[PDB]
Design a protein around this ligand. Structure first.
Ligand SMILES: *[C@@H]1O[C@H](CO)[C@@H](O)[C@H](O)[C@H]1NC(C)=O
Ligand SMILES: *[C@@H]1O[C@H](CO)[C@@H](O)[C@H](O)[C@H]1NC(C)=O
Ligand SMILES: *[C@@H]1O[C@H](CO)[C@@H](O)[C@H](O)[C@H]1NC(C)=O
Ligand SMILES: *[C@@H]1O[C@H](CO)[C@@H](O)[C@H](O)[C@H]1NC(C)=O
Ligand SMILES: *[C@@H]1O[C@H](CO)[C@@H](O)[C@H](O)[C@H]1NC(C)=O
Ligand SMILES: *[C@@H]1O[C@H](CO)[C@@H](O)[C@H](O)[C@H]1NC(C)=O
Ligand SMILES: *[C@@H]1O[C@H](CO)[C@@H](O)[C@H](O)[C@H]1NC(C)=O
Ligand SMILES: *[C@@H]1O[C@H](CO)[C@@H](O)[C@H](O)[C@H]1NC(C)=O
Lengths: 369, 369
């Protein structure tokens, strides 16, 4: 390899952007700026955008990637159907797919994921419930698939003396849903939704007087740190959730400041909420791929050829690289990155946060081990 | 229209076949044999087979169907991923998709389905549980998506004093799973799996002494009537499940006898288990489409043009035909066929059956209304 090339697929239709493209560039720059002994091949990241909601588009994008000679494909972060199409094609060609968003809910060739598994999210929520003395609860789901995502927790409630009252937004305003929860007179409300939908639910809850001291909320979104509930919350609250960020990572300041400058070219600096987790996962993903490829390269000569959608040819090194990906131990923006036999993150933590008027406080940690 | 043409997609990799191809021919023959006043256009059914487990294949099959000038696409019955690809392409081209297998779990343009909805299956199971005085239970799932398919029942257990212990086969032999259920010492076992997997679970249960009078089974498969548990069951049992068949339908004898001759060209007449429900749903589907098209044709002139995967052209009549499909009232092999505003079967029944040494007995009825 004259260069170590990977592809990344972005799907970002937000007004301000999540900054994944810049995050990828920052990882590449950081890695290429460190001259190693022996010298290593330059890292390249080819970036492709998804602008429609179309698996035709996603398939065509993969067909454009295969001829470029890549050692991995990253993402997309926020498009589960597209990520499944990517995983399938990557599996057929034996190119590693590096996943950076939620487990697809509900494949032979292996992939890895930097995003916490569904089981881990369930266990983290259950840890907070243990802290509440294992109460009855209500669950608000953005999508019906929540019962699958949270199957571990659901199975626990199904055999426990406590109850779980489940309600789906699917489809406009959560107010009638929240009024039913209020009538049940149960304190603990679990919200399984992305950040914007979670904000909407909390806003409507606040308006109904449901952010009083009686009620306790647990959110599943890993973008909790960017959820700003100004005007809803005081300096202390009962609104809990998670973060993966290690703000002490040596690159974290440059990362935040750089993404702030990314944000403030389409929007105002004052509205930058902090770095998006998906951007940090993409940064970390580049390092994981580079680490694995350089370790594989000590024991075997790695080459790439054009692959194609119109050929049954596979990448001969993909099986090997999947095993070396599973050997990676990397300290990233998102904490310790290591993988288990299923390609899932292991030996890591989630910080448990409580929302406040200006941001949050950390009040505990969930350990995957 | 000189002819009324629809397409049907088959995916059948069974040794003996389910007889869907013959079922389609029988419907076409029956309809074309009735000379109406005024005379109506001849019915044609173009048949396509899926032989791989590939959405590339399914998409290519749809691309072959679009130029043929069809008024609907039927199926496939037993291939959920392929049926979803078909629904998507049909929706893009505004051609009705007539579904004949389980609700996909977890679309703008409307479709209809002749197969009972997930909610209806949950409600039918809950009706049997009411008959058992609403006990605690165990659920054996072939796939994790069972919690979604049975979400209505799961939500009921989550708020009830009774427990539900859920276990997934996902992945070889159910024996260890059944031993855990045995240790829980709960009587009622719900099996959500297709017919062959359900048979396997009951066989292993029998071997463990778990088909004694203490245990009660409820199966979700609509192919219960073809599940032959010879050697497991006596003349009476506690093994319950469902059938859609109306064995008094005037065509039922010809249907059974004809599919018996279909079966016994690849296998032995003695191993023919009776007609497969998917074959009967395909037969009924042809009648539903013909009924709707001939009613639409009273009020508007229907034409077809070649459509194509490489064109954005839609079928101008698809919206109209979807509304007329929803007006159909048809008495079929699978009972009364009518649709609600969601395109789901309504105003119908499921017969509740108890397995016996030679077959079954009907012991009750579930009404959708
Ligand atoms: C493989 O190692 C050799 C020598 O140590 C180096 O020249 C080459 O750039 C390496 N390739 C990669 C992908 O880092
Ligand atoms: C965060 O990064 C700092 C600095 O590299 C490191 O000392 C620490 O172990 C990291 N923390 C976690 C939880 O991974
Ligand atoms: C973004 O940059 C602005 C301008 O320098 C700064 O005031 C603000 O606090 C930054 N936001 C964050 C979250 O770092
Ligand atoms: C888990 O990760 C920590 C760093 O966060 C590391 O020090 C430790 O060696 C790992 N432990 C195991 C059991 O691998
Ligand atoms: C539409 O009705 C006319 C006359 O009643 C008939 O000739 C024609 O075959 C009909 N078309 C279909 C699709 O049945
Ligand atoms: C079964 O078919 C017979 C004969 O057409 C009909 O009388 C009866 O209503 C049908 N039964 C049901 C439940 O639809
Ligand atoms: C199939 O046909 C055979 C031969 O006539 C007959 O003995 C058998 O009972 C039939 N099976 C069924 C289920 O009707
Ligand atoms: C429901 O179907 C039955 C036939 O099974 C039919 O007689 C009846 O008119 C229908 N009832 C309603 C409310 O549509």
């Amino acid at each position: 390899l004259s260069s170590l090339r990977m592809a990344a697929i972005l799907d970002d239709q937000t007004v301000c952007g999540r900054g994944e493209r810049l995050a990828l560039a920052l990882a590449r720059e950081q890695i290429n700026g460190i001259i190693e002994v022996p010298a290593k091949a330059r890292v390249e990241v080819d970036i492709f955008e998804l602008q429609r909601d179309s698996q035709y588009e996603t398939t065509d994008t993969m067909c454009q990637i295969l001829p470029k000679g890549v050692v991995s494909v990253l993402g997309p972060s926020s498009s589960p159907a597209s990520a499944s199409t990517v995983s399938h094609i990557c599996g057929e060609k034996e190119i590693p797919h590096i996943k950076v968003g939620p487990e697809e809910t509900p494949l032979r060739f292996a992939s890895v994921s930097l995003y916490p598994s569904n089981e881990d999210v369930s266990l983290a929520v259950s840890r907070i419930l243990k802290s509440f003395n294992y109460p009855s609860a209500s669950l608000i789901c953005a999508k019906a698939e929540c019962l699958l995502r949270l199957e571990e927790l659901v199975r626990g409630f199904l055999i426990s003396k406590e109850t779980l009252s489940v309600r789906m937004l699917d489809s406009r305003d959560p107010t009638p849903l929240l009024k039913e929860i209020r009538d049940d007179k149960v304190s603990t409300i679990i919200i399984d939704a992305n950040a914007s939908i979670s904000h909407l639910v909390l806003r409507k809850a606040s308006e109904l007087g449901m952010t009083s001291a009686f009620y306790k909320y647990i959110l599943t979104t890993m973008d909790f740190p960017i959820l700003h509930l100004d005007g809803i919350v005081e300096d202390s609250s009962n609104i809990l959730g998670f973060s993966m960020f290690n703000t002490s990572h040596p690159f974290y300041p440059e990362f935040v400041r750089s993404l702030n400058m990314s944000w403030r070219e389409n929007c105002e600096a004052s509205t930058y909420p902090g770095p998006a987790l998906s951007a940090a996962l993409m940064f970390d993903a580049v390092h994981v791929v580079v680490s694995a490829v350089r370790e594989l390269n000590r024991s075997q000569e790695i080459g790439v050829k054009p692959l194609a959608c119109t050929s049954a040819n596979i990448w001969p090194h993909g099986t090997s690289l999947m095993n070396y990906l599973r050997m990676v131990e990397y300290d990233g923006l998102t904490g310790r990155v290591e993988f288990n036999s299923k390609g899932q993150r292991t030996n890591y933590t989630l910080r448990i946060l409580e929302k406040s008027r200006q941001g949050h406080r950390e009040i505990g940690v969930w350990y995957s081990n």
